[PDB]
């Protein structure tokens, strides 16, 4: 069992990115992991200080399951899975293409853009709202990249006990 939460004060006001999301094992707050949401019409996980702890179950992110769970994906199957894997490989914090440094982004801005790039595929939603031109440039690079991804990178899905809340995803390497 995991809890998922937003860390509303993680980034400064100028990054316009409060909904930085993490998951944590309920049996251990020694470690937390960065994750990204999908199904944006649902509610974000509650803030870390909330008296409401939003619980999640992890599941292997197969193409079939991912597509089934996405409410309005832009593409389906392997293409949806691989498109998202690549965004994460190229986004915060993997940064495989050096996009962060190229556009002189802060950590918060880069993570925000990675989230927006995920939504482009999972939710058919490319939001440019409140972005600077360099952020728009970075986001467009991120969503249009076609670099090869490592062959052993896989998707983890996190499904909330309560369907009111957003689904979450992360990646890992099979070693």
Numbering used by the authors: 102 to 276
Mind quoting what the paper says about this structure?
The only fully conserved residues, the thioester-forming Cys and Gln, are found in a [YFL]CΦζ motif (where Φ is any hydrophobic and ζ any hydrophilic residue) and a weak ΦQζΦΦ motif, respectively. Both motifs are consistently predicted to reside in a β-sheet secondary structure context.
Internal thioester bonds are formed between the side chains of Cys and Gln residues, most likely self-generated by a favorable environment during protein folding. Here we experimentally demonstrate that thioester domains are prevalent in Gram-positive surface proteins, and that they share a conserved three-dimensional structure despite being divergent in protein sequence. This suggests that thioester domains may target distinct receptors and have a widespread but currently unappreciated role in mediating pathogen adhesion to hosts. Putative TEDs appear in a variety of domain architectures, but are almost always located at the N-termini of proteins containing secretion signals and C-terminal LPXTG cell wall-anchoring motifs.
